[PDB]
Design a protein around this motif. Structure first.
Motif, mmCIF file in Angstrom:
data_model
loop_
_atom_site.group_PDB
_atom_site.id
_atom_site.type_symbol
_atom_site.label_atom_id
_atom_site.label_comp_id
_atom_site.label_asym_id
_atom_site.label_seq_id
_atom_site.Cartn_x
_atom_site.Cartn_y
_atom_site.Cartn_z
ATOM 1 N N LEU A 64 26.747 16.103 10.153
ATOM 2 C CA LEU A 64 25.700 16.156 9.144
ATOM 3 C C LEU A 64 25.353 14.750 8.686
ATOM 4 N N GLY A 65 24.056 14.447 8.666
ATOM 5 C CA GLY A 65 23.571 13.196 8.132
ATOM 6 C C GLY A 65 22.318 13.431 7.312
ATOM 7 N N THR A 123 25.425 8.801 7.511
ATOM 8 C CA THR A 123 26.415 9.776 7.960
ATOM 9 C C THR A 123 27.803 9.359 7.497
ATOM 10 N N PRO A 124 28.084 9.463 6.202
ATOM 11 C CA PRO A 124 29.441 9.214 5.723
ATOM 12 C C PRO A 124 30.401 10.243 6.288
ATOM 13 N N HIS A 156 32.455 19.550 5.267
ATOM 14 C CA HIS A 156 31.416 19.371 4.270
ATOM 15 C C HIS A 156 31.106 17.889 4.130
ATOM 16 N N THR A 157 29.976 17.609 3.499
ATOM 17 C CA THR A 157 29.556 16.242 3.261
ATOM 18 C C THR A 157 30.144 15.729 1.952
ATOM 19 N N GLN A 158 30.122 14.416 1.794
ATOM 20 C CA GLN A 158 30.616 13.750 0.596
ATOM 21 C C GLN A 158 29.409 13.178 -0.130
ATOM 22 N N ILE A 181 21.395 12.850 21.813
ATOM 23 C CA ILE A 181 21.796 13.942 20.943
ATOM 24 C C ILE A 181 20.565 14.751 20.568
ATOM 25 N N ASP A 182 20.803 15.863 19.888
ATOM 26 C CA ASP A 182 19.741 16.693 19.349
ATOM 27 C C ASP A 182 19.808 16.665 17.832
ATOM 28 N N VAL A 183 18.646 16.630 17.195
ATOM 29 C CA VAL A 183 18.538 16.644 15.744
ATOM 30 C C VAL A 183 17.910 17.964 15.333
ATOM 31 N N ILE A 184 18.586 18.679 14.443
ATOM 32 C CA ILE A 184 18.155 19.985 13.968
ATOM 33 C C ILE A 184 17.919 19.882 12.472
ATOM 34 N N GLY A 185 16.743 20.297 12.032
ATOM 35 C CA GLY A 185 16.446 20.252 10.622
ATOM 36 C C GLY A 185 15.198 21.038 10.312
#
Ligand SMILES: [Mg+2]
Ligand SMILES: [Mg+2]
Ligand SMILES: [Mg+2]
Ligand SMILES: [Mg+2]
Ligand SMILES: [Mg+2]
Ligand SMILES: [Mg+2]
Ligand SMILES: [Mg+2]
Ligand SMILES: [Mg+2]
Ligand SMILES: [Mg+2]
Ligand SMILES: [Mg+2]
Ligand SMILES: [Mg+2]
Ligand SMILES: [Mg+2]
Ligand SMILES: [Mg+2]
Ligand SMILES: [Mg+2]
Lengths: 190, 251, 148, 109, 199, 138, 176
Positions: free
Chosen positions: B46-47, B80-81, B164-166, B216-220
């Motif tokens: 996740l970014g 992307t932490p 999960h993200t921070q 890569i692939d980006v999904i959003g």
RNA sequence: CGGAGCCUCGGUUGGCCUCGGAUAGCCGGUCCCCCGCCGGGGUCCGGUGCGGAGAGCCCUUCGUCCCGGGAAACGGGGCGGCCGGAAAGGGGGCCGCCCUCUCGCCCGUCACGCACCGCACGUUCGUGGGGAACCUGGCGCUAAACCAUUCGUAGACGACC
RNA sequence: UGGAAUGCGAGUGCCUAGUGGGCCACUUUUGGUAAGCAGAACUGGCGCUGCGGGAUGAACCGAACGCCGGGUUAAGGCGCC
């Protein structure tokens, strides 16, 4: 019309042992074993005698199409006997007017590479069927020898090579280049 | 009668319905097919879209007009932490498709991740996982966890982590963390669970998931634009200026 | 029903389906039966057919009313002048086609027979075609058993 | 103690394809799958037995929610063992596909 | 209570005709192994039949039907639905008395399965006629769980084989036991033979 | 694979038809579907019968094709097909089938009691054989 | 004529009605195969009318009676000479059958003519029926049964009691 | 987790706890012989209009008393532990116990029970499903959703972040 | 000896409404390439008429209708609907 009985017999050489598991035929000989299942045909298989063995095929109450299957089984069984005793050896010649056809044998005769066929940069790679070995012929130039115990595997292997070298978008009566099956023999002549 | 002159249809019927996404976070519909001969690895991350710039580089493309020449290329920066692995979810292959089998969660979960479980964090008593966490702290509960892990080793075919993200490291107003399942590809199922179990509550940098020059692939979800007419939504020809009753239409 | 068949069926007194009558045969009558061939099954009844037909389903035409022949006086008052005074005299006049067949037979109301139990073959074609219409000769008796 | 009645199903009413005679019910009896076997069941009592909200008097008992419509087998139907039955009132269509008790009386054996 | 049928070696339409009449009389039916069901005719002409079905769709809104189910169980289910008056309450009640399964999931894996000899392929077809497999046909029109169902059906057969060996074991003891106690049960063995129960 | 053949002299059991339950001998074959059969010692007149209503047994009498009923009976008596038939398990299973069918209500009661006691005795012995087999495993 | 059920063989004898010219007209006989005697007389008048200046009105039936099979317990080969109308012509056929009765063989001819040629019974004229010795038969379907040591099995016996039981636990066995 | 009842909803009126399959072939024993992590092939022997048969199997209910003969004694009934099951997961079997019975089955002996005076909806599954309540004990829990406010990655309004 | 069979009660007179667009089928038949076209003969239909069958349908096939019970049928049918 249904025919009461239609039968044919096959003579088994002394060095070949044939066993039946229903309609599955197992032929064991000097060169190995071949198993073929005939469960797609409603016939009756029988092994007769002990000193000079024979195989009998029976078709009771058969119409014209079902009668034609009686000899087909006998011919297949005979080929299996031929495979396990003499083996099958198809030879192929490569024909070309200008561009030599270079053949390289890989993977102990299970892969065939064909190069410069009509000058094409594309490399053709034909995979032999299991139990079939291809080899360049030390006796003659521009020749291959395919050997195996199953006639259909050997002959299918050769059909693959022959159809790999097909001419496209030309008059094939003029452009005759290709590798063709030139002889149908046996591995051991006897 | 047949239309006078041929023309391709506007738009793709493959992206229908042109509705608002039910999800705000892009969903991985298909994960890469698992190859048990590769080492255990993650397949997604996740970014956050930070913005765009351009770079200069020398291309290496033999036979091209830009071979050994510098070009200006636009790029997107995605912050992307490292993510934190907080759970493992197992899946069993059934004649009705994959079915969730068993979910386990780490003993500790940060408040960023717990915020995901609430619609009003302000008004909540923050009771999420307060009784589940006690299972790791006692011998009886611990003996049940490893039994759940052993069960997952026997039956599950697909393993995913819950990372999960921070959000406390990002500059955004949002403090609620984005939590997603990432499929663990690589070795046997047992190796997947050993790998995942060691990483509960641990951080995973993006460099451990991706590499340089990788495709890569980006999904959003795309930028929203609200109610649009056919001219903008589907790119049909504008009708002449003389049209009565509007010209930004399909006739 | 075509006009010529409609008239001939009315003269035989067969105005309803599965109605029955005796018809003494001769050139005049046999040619009437040929006109109505598609509309009738006929044939030669045996003695048993005449018995059962007149006992179970025999009604006299007395003062133009349909009266069951439950008593012998019913026959005697009407046909007595011809010496027909009992059901047996009536069955003998019909079966042997006596001198007063005309009177004894007009006396009998057309027999109201039921649908054939066990079905038909094909009412629309002749008996010799595997159907039912026409002259089936003595085979009428089997038909009479199933309808009486 | 035990069951004393044969198991039947209310298959449907008497009918052609587009006309229905509700006064006759077609019954399917367990184990009777030919017409020559239906002979035992001709004239036997039949009971559609059901339950309702309100209590009703029970002969030889106290009021309960059980109710019954009585009938009897009248003749065989078809070749495969179906029988025709008649009841004191036409059966309710909600009874189609449900159990019909066939009693062993009036006994002829 | 429940009539459990095994779909292997049954012809699609003959099984549906019998099953449909059964649930209309109020009986519950379970058909398992719908992928094992057969259809008369070569595979190719049966694949063309489903592709012809697949082309039937509301030209103005395909989402409104027909719905082309790809599972061998649902194909069979729709075939039984075609033999029922499903637009009436009576037909829909019957349609709810039928369960259809690919493979044999629990609890039917550990229950005995009945067959319908009037729909068996070995009975109804001439042996020289070609036929299709519902599972192969379904797999080639978009069914996705052919490989998984086979994987789970092989696990079941391994367990059923162990169960069969246990039952043969308990039957060998049963025969031995009858010899050991032959003296004590001889009198009761005469009653049974006198009346045909034992031959 | 075939062990029983439609031939002259083969004795066939009649499974259904007006002569169900009887034995006849194949005297001659008419066509693919019908045969001339004879039952001189089993109360069947010489007649045509389809093979559909026939089940071949293992007996094969020796008389010429289309021999008259005198010699079919003579071969039947020499082979004693009637007593040999009754000694086969096939005949016995038929006998058991009809014995059970005619069982009376009282007979069914007595079988239930005998079966009740016989099954308990066997089950107890099986339990002991299982326990004995356990000790060897240990 | 409908070839209903098994046909019977009838001996029908007829003649012209006597007249002052010929007080004793000659007698004619035919072999008729029909379902009943009523049909048998009808077909007679149909055949003689095609051969003579005669018909039911100007003639009478002198004798109608069934001819009984003379060796109903002996297998025989029957040759049948018939003519029939197809959709587009008329043809003469010779056919053979094996049967115990001559009327049974003729019935097989009607079913066979219907099966193999879609010929309705009204378009078939059986000209002659003979009993033929095995050495004179021509059709291989009949000759294959001229074997003193004929033997053959019954392969793939299909279950005909397919609804008793309708549901069973064991699958049927076709080998016996 | 461990009492009386009251409504309402219906149907049902013993159970089968499982090889895989072949069908011009099958099924069961047999390990003496050959392989394998007790299982597979061979031999040999039996069955095959399937009888190690769903044309089947299991259970069977009137009850109690007295005393006999067979059957049990390794037996019936009853609280604690370990394997074991995932496709839609087991109130099976096994080991301990302190208890609890010599009755459960079969053939007899001996009498008795509302024997309700010929008669229906009888006989279970049934501590059935759902709903209110009333108690009466033990061990446990002390939440969120929506509105309102804010945001602008959203937005015609709702919705959404 | 009311002079062939069979059947049937007949004759007669006033007043009179609606109708005076028809259409269909077997067979015969005119014009027309033909038409679910136009135009005739014969009979029967629909129109005015429901009902069983032909899935559906003016005319096809069966059969014509007071309100019912039982039985049996026609033409058509009997895998399931
Ligand atoms: Mg060119
Ligand atoms: Mg175009
Ligand atoms: Mg304007
Ligand atoms: Mg009847
Ligand atoms: Mg007509
Ligand atoms: Mg009840
Ligand atoms: Mg799709
Ligand atoms: Mg006109
Ligand atoms: Mg009008
Ligand atoms: Mg009128
Ligand atoms: Mg009308
Ligand atoms: Mg139509
Ligand atoms: Mg009526
Ligand atoms: Mg119909």
């Amino acid at each position: 019309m249904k025919t009461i009985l239609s039968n044919q017999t096959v003579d088994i050489p002394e060095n070949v042992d044939i066993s039946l598991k229903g309609r599955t035929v197992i032929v064991k000989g000097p060169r190995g074993t071949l198993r073929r299942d005939f469960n797609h045909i409603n016939v009756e298989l029988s092994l007769l005698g002990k000193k000079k063995k024979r195989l009998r095929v029976d078709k009771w109450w058969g119409n014209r199409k079902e009668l034609a299957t009686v000899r087909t089984i006998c011919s297949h069984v005979q080929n299996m006997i031929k495979g396990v005793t003499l083996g099958f050896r198809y030879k192929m010649r490569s024909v070309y007017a200008h561009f030599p056809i270079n053949v390289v044998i890989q993977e102990n005769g299970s892969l065939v590479e064909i190069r410069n066929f009509l000058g094409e940069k594309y490399i053709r790679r034909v995979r032999m069927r299991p139990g079939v070995a291809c080899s360049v012929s030390q006796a003659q130039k521009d020749e291959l020898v395919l050997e195996g115990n199953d006639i259909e595997l050997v002959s299918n292997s050769a059909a693959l090579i022959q159809q790999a070298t097909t001419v496209k978008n030309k008059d094939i009566r003029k452009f005759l280049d290709g590798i063709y099956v030139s002889e149908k023999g046996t591995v051991q002549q006897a | 009668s047949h239309r006078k002159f041929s023309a391709p249809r506007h738009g793709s019927l493959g992206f229908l319905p042109r509705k608002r996404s039910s999800r705000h976070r892009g969903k991985v519909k298909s994960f890469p097919k698992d190859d048990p001969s590769k080492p255990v690895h993650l397949t997604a991350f996740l970014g956050y879209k930070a913005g765009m710039t351009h770079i200069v580089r020398e291309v290496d493309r033999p036979g091209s007009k830009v071979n050994k020449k510098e070009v200006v290329e636009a790029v997107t920066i995605v912050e992307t932490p490292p993510m934190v692995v907080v759970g493992i979810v197992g899946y069993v292959e059934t004649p009705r498709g994959l079915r969730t089998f068993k979910t386990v969660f780490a003993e500790h979960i940060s408040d960023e991740c717990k915020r995901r479980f609430y619609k009003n964090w302000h008004k909540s008593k923050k009771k999420a996982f307060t009784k589940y966490c006690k299972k790791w702290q006692d011998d009886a509960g611990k003996r049940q966890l490893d039994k759940d892990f052993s069960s997952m080793k026997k039956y599950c075919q697909v393993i995913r982590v819950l990372a999960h993200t921070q959000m406390r490291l990002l500059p955004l107003r949002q403090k609620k963390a984005h939590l997603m399942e990432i499929q663990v590809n690589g070795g046997t199922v047992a190796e997947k669970l050993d790998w995942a179990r060691e990483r509960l509550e641990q951080q995973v940098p993006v460099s451990q998931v991706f590499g340089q020059d990788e495709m890569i692939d980006v999904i959003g979800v795309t930028k929203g634009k609200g109610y649009k007419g056919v001219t903008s939504r589907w790119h049909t020809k504008k009708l002449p200026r003389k049209t009565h009753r509007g010209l930004r239409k399909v006739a | 029903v075509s006009p010529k068949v409609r008239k001939v069926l009315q003269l035989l007194r067969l105005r309803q389906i599965f109605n029955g009558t005796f018809v003494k045969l001769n050139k005049a009558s046999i040619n009437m039966l040929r006109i109505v061939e598609p509309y009738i099954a006929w044939g030669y009844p045996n003695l048993k057919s005449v018995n059962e037909l007149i006992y179970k389903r025999g009604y006299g035409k007395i003062n133009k009313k349909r009266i069951a022949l439950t008593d012998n006086t019913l026959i005697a008052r009407s046909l007595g002048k011809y010496n027909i005074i009992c059901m047996e005299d009536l069955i003998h006049e019909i079966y042997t086609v006596g001198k007063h067949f005309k009177e004894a037979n007009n006396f009998l109301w057309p027999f109201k027979l039921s649908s054939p139990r066990g079905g038909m073959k094909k009412k629309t074609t002749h008996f010799v075609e595997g159907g039912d219409a026409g002259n089936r000769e003595d085979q009428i008796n089997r038909l009479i058993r199933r309808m009486n | 103690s035990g069951r004393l009645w044969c198991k039947a199903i209310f298959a449907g009413y008497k009918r052609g394809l587009r006309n229905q005679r509700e006064h006759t019910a077609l019954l399917k009896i367990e184990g009777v799958y030919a017409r020559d076997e239906t002979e035992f069941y001709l004239g036997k009592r039949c009971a559609y037995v059901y339950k309702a909200k309100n209590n009703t008097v029970t002969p030889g008992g106290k009021p309960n929610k059980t109710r019954v419509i009585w009938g009897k087998v009248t003749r065989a139907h078809g070749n495969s063992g179906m029988v025709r039955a008649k009841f004191r009132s036409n059966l309710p269509a909600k009874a189609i596909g449900h159990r019909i008790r066939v009693m062993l009386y009036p006994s002829r054996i | 209570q429940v009539l459990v049928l095994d779909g292997r070696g049954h012809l699609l339409g003959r099984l549906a005709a019998i099953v449909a009449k059964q649930v209309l009389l109020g009986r519950k039916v379970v058909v398992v192994r719908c992928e094992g069901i057969n259809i008369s005719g070569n595979f190719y002409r049966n694949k063309l039949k489903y592709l012809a079905f697949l082309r039937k769709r509301m030209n103005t809104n395909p989402s409104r039907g027909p719905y082309h189910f790809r599972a061998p169980s649902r194909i069979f289910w729709r075939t039984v639905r075609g033999m029922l008056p499903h637009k009436t309450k009576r037909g829909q009640a019957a349609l709810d008395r039928l369960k259809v399964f690919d493979g044999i999931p629990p609890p039917y894996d550990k229950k005995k399965r009945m067959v319908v000899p009037a729909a068996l392929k070995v009975v109804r077809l001439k042996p020289t006629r070609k036929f299709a497999y519902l599972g192969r046909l379904a797999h080639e029109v978009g069914w996705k769980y052919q490989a998984v169902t086979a994987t789970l059906e092989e696990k079941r057969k391994e367990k059923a084989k162990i169960h069969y060996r246990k039952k043969k074991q308990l039957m060998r003891l049963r025969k031995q036991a009858e010899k050991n106690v032959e003296k004590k049960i001889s009198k009761f063995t005469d009653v049974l033979k006198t009346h045909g129960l034992l031959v | 694979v075939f062990r029983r053949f439609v031939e002259v002299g083969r004795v066939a059991y009649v499974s259904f038809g007006p002569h169900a339950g009887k034995l006849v001998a194949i005297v001659d074959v008419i066509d693919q579907n019908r045969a001339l059969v004879d039952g001189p010692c089993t109360r069947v007149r010489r007649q045509a019968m389809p093979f559909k209503c026939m089940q071949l047994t293992d007996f094969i009498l020796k008389f010429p094709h289309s021999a008259r009923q005198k010699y079919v009976r003579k071969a039947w008596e020499k082979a004693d097909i009637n007593t040999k038939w009754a000694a086969t398990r096939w005949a016995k299973k038929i006998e058991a089938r009809e014995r059970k069918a005619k069982m009376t209500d009282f007979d069914r009661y007595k079988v239930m009691k005998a079966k009740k006691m016989r099954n308990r005795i066997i089950k107890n012995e099986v339990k002991k054989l299982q326990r004995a087999a356990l000790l060897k495993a240990s | 004529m409908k070839a209903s059920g098994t046909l019977r063989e009838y001996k029908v004898v007829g003649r012209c009605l006597p007249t002052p010219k010929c007080r004793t007209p000659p007698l004619y006989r035919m072999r008729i195969f029909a379902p009943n005697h009523v049909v048998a007389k009808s077909r007679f008048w149909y055949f003689v009318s095609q051969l003579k200046k005669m018909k039911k009105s100007s003639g009478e039936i002198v004798y109608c009676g069934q001819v009984f099979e003379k060796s109903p317990l002996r297998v025989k080969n029957f040759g049948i000479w018939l003519r029939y109308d197809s959709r587009s012509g008329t043809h003469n056929m010779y056919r053979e059958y094996r049967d115990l009765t001559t009327a049974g063989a003729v019935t097989q001819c009607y079913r066979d003519m219907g099966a193999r040629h879609r010929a309705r019974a009204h378009s078939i004229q059986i000209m002659k029926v003979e009993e033929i010795a095995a050495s004179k038969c021509r059709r291989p379907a009949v000759k294959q049964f001229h074997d003193s040591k004929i033997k053959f099995p019954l392969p793939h016996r299909v279950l005909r009691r397919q609804h008793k039981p309708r549901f069973t636990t064991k699958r049927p066995n076709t080998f016996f």
